[model samples]
Target: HHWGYGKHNGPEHWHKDFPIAKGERQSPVDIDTHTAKYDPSLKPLSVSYDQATSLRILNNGHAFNVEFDDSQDKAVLKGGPLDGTYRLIQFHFHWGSLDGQGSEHTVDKKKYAAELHLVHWNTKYGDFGKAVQQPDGMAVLGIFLKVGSAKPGLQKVVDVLDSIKTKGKSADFTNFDPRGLLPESLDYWTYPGSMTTPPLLESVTWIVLKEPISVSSEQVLKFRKLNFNGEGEPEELMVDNWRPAQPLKLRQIKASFK
Candidate 1:
């Protein structure tokens, strides 16, 4: 499962090891907003995140993750293109080397500096590991990040950067509302896609928000300091851990708002 955005092992070569990387339902496709089908039938998304469920933060070698206790239904995602309750398990980010080019999914070829993924698993599947193997077992909510005013709530997450600079490091991160990190509007364009990383399972129901959240330049820079190298290995700054836009060959974008 060890992979990086390096010249020899990046997205372009992922298919050699993980055959599914070249699958039909791949993710990170360019979203053409003007052509998106505005389906009024889509219901408003329901996001209930319990601050207490947030356990800690860790540098997982691939990305910095905010892991949650999904043992209980404390935090969940429902009501939008999902069959049942999908428990909020963890959240992480993918960023770029520069301020304007990091997001995995783009809008009309527009790339954001970063992207956040809030991953959830369906209750029907029993657990995350098993859930990812099923077609409708996971829902990943995507939020784009741009350079603008300092987002006050983001500062809380950014403040912990110093403690977890190196890979495998972690610290307690509790009492923080994941909902506060979201944009005001839940309007989104959704489609069936796969994981952007290795294994690249085609199980995710992607709900990408239309509105972009603001993050200060300094805060965005902190993400680059994260190391993809675990423990005492040579330092490799974690940047550009995003997949390039894949072709939308047999897919359709569904909009939740008119």
Candidate 2:
């Protein structure tokens, strides 16, 4: 009994319930390279992901998420625009209804085939829930996905999708380093924004990579087979689960490298 990426509940109508959906610092803005400022002071990101922290992966009705045991800072991201250590919580993806295009954020209005988001919460905030309310609460590293060769780094995940094809389904997906999916270069654009989902809280520090990683068309389509409904329920394709780009407003997007 809530919002979803449906014709009636998609981003266009999120503001009806969650006013913050149209908040000043919304996410997935079109990264205008020409307008972005080059900040040499931005520190190189420090990401230490312990494979032991990988707990399980779930099909959360909205998106497929690989969750982490964030009870401790076993896997954490620091530096860059962050002021404190942000513990890895989960990572997920957003893709198009079809193969052509469906990324939330665009580069010069160039939409990619899909996008990946690595979610983390600030350890200084005590817990993830509380941290979501503070300005320096979360840091989400976004990696854009282009259609090309099949990425072997994602095989383990795609291999297990059949197990959790329906909503409320999950499986043990441990001892896997989530960082293996990152690109060679960490050059990225940073800005202040809100979570792209319901209760769109304006508490995230978004670090979006400039370069995209590649995945096969077959791999991208596997995500569409995921069901929004649970077992025995009417099957609904979990496709196009992405929020559209929001207004830039007063935020200044900074780049790590020129």
Candidate 3:
């Protein structure tokens, strides 16, 4: 019913349904680190994630998402490119069938095995639905997942994949501190971009971390076990669930550190 990362409904065909998919501020742009200018005024990003806020993990037919209890400001993201506090809502991932190329945003055209997105909505907008309509409505933290050693930080999420193997299936997943998934360095690249998925609204402030967290090839294979087809439909593995980097256009990418 919705857009998918398939040959027919994938990123290329999104513009037909959602014209903004080709808009000026579209996301997942290639980050040319050599050209990214450093902004001394940009403050260090502040992320406070409460373990109890994590609610459940679901296979949304596109990717697996870990929903959080965003009713309050218990887990919030502030500073960096954000003007006010943004409440953590959900987090998800994009991956490929192979280990060579999976990430949406590339570093000088360098691709990683997978990518993680921590979505947050600005508190000033009252609710996420209304906030997403504004330019400064969302702040998403992008973390690249390079294939290397097994990451215990990501083990818990991988452990629950078998429970929600099919689309629309979900299981209770709580007491998880997302902070453990982050890398040692908070240095990042900031830009004004849009949601990488459909209804590609140009409302997200992208804060992409430079340092990537490690994951093993075996774990990525576990992600591939997820089905894009629902329970009653024919099983189709969910892989390469990533949109290619969009043109940067006139937007400038700022760096938090030198």
Candidate 4:
């Protein structure tokens, strides 16, 4: 059965098929800031992106993704808990139907309106498919989105949602810089975790930013306009596509700033 955010195929039921869903380093853990140790050794994150590398935006069955040209290091992430450069592969979002709750990683038990994930794979592993199986092969930058002022960066993505309303629809989206979406402050919490979705491999080194960028409530409604179902199937609005906070287990979360 295909995995989704619905009751039958949701995160709770994922362990049946993807046994690694119950793995030790599962992601979207509640970030208890009070308990997080501030590690001065963690360096500031360095991200360099070429706008031309953005290829297309598509509505995958789970969420909408903006794929990049990862053939080389056109857009890459370095430093900040990573051993080497990681190529940007794709970026996606998770949000709720309502404004109050949708973010995957919560801070001090508070959830934001949405969350953006910029996925990258370590160059040391050759390619994305091969990299995803290694413990430190993936790096995901998580940025929380709160409902406040309108974000111009996100508006560009919202403008094309009507075209790719159904699952599997894609549109050319070039010259888009994903870096513009990040908040000014890069202070973040770092941890070793798995993908929030199926195949749940324990590969990602998660860097969740503390400061959130603003997105008006209206933009969130536009995101909800995209359908999880295929063009011919009964339409199902894609919302609440986020996994709840998982157990922290024996993992230690490190803060980049004091």
lDDT per model vs. reference: 0.91, 0.89, 0.93, 0.93
User: What is candidate 4's lDDT per residue for 219-239, written digit by digit as tens?
Assistant: 998998889999999989999
Clashing pairs in 2: none
Query: In model 3, which regions exceed 4 Å deviation?
Result: none
- Give per-residue CA lDDT, model 3, range 100-161, as digits (tens): 88999999999999999999999999999999999999999999999999988889999999
Reference-based TM-score of each model: 0.97, 0.97, 0.98, 0.98
lDDT of 4 at 55: 92
Question: What stretches of model 1 exceed 4 Å from their correct place?
Answer: 50-52
Q: In model 4, which regions exceed 4 Å deviation?
A: none
Question: What 10-residue stretch in candidate 2 is worst by lDDT?
Answer: 46-55
lDDT of 2 at 181: 90
Clashes of each: 0, 0, 0, 0
TM-score ranking of the models: 4, 3, 2, 1
CA RMSD of each candidate after superposition: 1.3, 1.1, 0.9, 0.9
> In candidate 1, what are the lDDT values of residues 110-214, reduced to their tens digit?
999999999999999898999999999899999999999888878888999888988789999987778878999999999999999988999999999999999
lDDT of 1: 0.91
Query: On a 0 to 100 scale, what is the lDDT of residue 234 in model 2?
Result: 92
